[PDB]
């Protein structure tokens, strides 16, 4: 009974970062070999856990969060970072225990003339708490005058499209990101490695 990591890593469509997807991995056997062998990921960074020993560990639960961002922004998917993504879209906690995996997806998520499906939150009054997901689309009020749901001066739509084009520099090309969070609590461990 193997964990459905393929549904996450090999999904055909990915979510926007502001509406990042969370898959709950439980009651299964986790084989993390796909992370070591391939060298098909451009980012593989673990915190609070040893990367090479993942197959020896059991956990209460696993979370697989998935989204798409710019290459320039993959550095923000880590504990203690700041910027538009970490502040307004996807925030890891300082004591994060898990791994961040990312790979370039320019051939899949970029379209000629701009792909407008992937968005990021551009305006927000305060930062996100760790693992907070804000899907609001209310007009952002930048001044004292209320917006009443119409765009205009001091009244911005809070989301902006990445508009991924294949001509983009590597830093502005789309990257697919999966964050594995490892939860160890005083409960039965339902996700163990092989054997």
């Amino acid at each position: 009974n193997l964990c459905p990591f393929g549904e996450v890593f090999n999904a055909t469509r990915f979510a926007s970062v502001y509406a990042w997807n969370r898959k709950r991995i439980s009651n299964c056997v986790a084989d993390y070999s796909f992370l070591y062998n391939s060298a098909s990921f451009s980012t593989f960074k673990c915190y609070g856990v040893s990367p090479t020993k993942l197959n020896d560990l059991c956990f209460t639960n696993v979370y697989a969060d998935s989204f798409v961002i710019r290459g320039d922004e993959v550095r923000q998917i880590a504990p203690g970072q700041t910027g538009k993504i970490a502040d307004y879209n996807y925030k890891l906690p300082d004591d994060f225990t898990g791994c961040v995996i990312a790979w370039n997806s320019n051939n899949l998520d970029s379209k000629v003339g701009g792909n407008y499906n992937y968005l990021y939150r551009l305006f927000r009054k305060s930062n996100l708490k760790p693992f907070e997901r804000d899907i609001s689309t209310e007009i952002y009020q930048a001044g004292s005058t209320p917006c009443n749901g119409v765009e205009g001066f001091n009244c911005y739509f809070p989301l902006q499209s990445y508009g991924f084009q294949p001509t983009n520099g590597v830093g502005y090309q789309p990257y697919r990101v999966v964050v594995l969070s490892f939860e160890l609590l005083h409960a039965p461990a339902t996700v163990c490695g092989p054997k």
Partner: antibody, heavy 117, light 109 residues
Framework: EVQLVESGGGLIQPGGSLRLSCAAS????????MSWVRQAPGKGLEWVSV???????FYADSVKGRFTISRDNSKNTLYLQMNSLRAEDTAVYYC???????????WGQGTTVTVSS | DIQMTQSPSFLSASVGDRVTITCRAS??????LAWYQQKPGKAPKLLIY???TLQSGVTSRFSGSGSGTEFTLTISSLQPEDFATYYC??????????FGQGTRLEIKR
Amino acid sequence: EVQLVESGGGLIQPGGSLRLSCAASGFTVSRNYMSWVRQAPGKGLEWVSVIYSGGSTFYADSVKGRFTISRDNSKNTLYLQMNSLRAEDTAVYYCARDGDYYGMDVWGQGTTVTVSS
Amino acid sequence: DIQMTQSPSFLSASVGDRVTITCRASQGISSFLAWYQQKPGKAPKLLIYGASTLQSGVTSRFSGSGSGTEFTLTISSLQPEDFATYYCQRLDSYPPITFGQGTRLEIKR
């Protein structure tokens, strides 16, 4: 009225410190990206610093570690504290309400900083 | 870093002319580009954002086009208040933030 009013520029020796102020009207400072951009004599525009509505701050490499951007919400005012000033910091300094994809739409009138021994 | 190069450095034209100035990004940046105007001794004025969206209040004679690496600002009917310096900017409020070095539009004789 929508405006940014700057002050605090002046003449100072290298190694000195200077605080620039930027009072806003027509929008709320704490709810916007706010940037400092400078222009040396006869040169182009150089972005200096930015502060997010959520509080994150960022700096250009040329001033990182020496300048500090901040804000006072009670006065709706942006500040730039400049330490360890150098001759090449000499410039007209502008504040602006930044909008990322929306560009910088509201600019202050600029205040002049001269660093010389 | 992605460089932003404006061309040419100085451009001469007459009142009534149709004028184009170019900004080149060293790498593709989709439509994350702004155009500003600046007269001597005054602060910049936002003309275009999103490569083609005209800032409100700016005259329709200004038009921005291009996407990726080549961007153009076009002034369809030059009026005397248009003689100034014009800057481009990559649109991304995160370091590094880069402006073009500027194009000065001057009176032809």
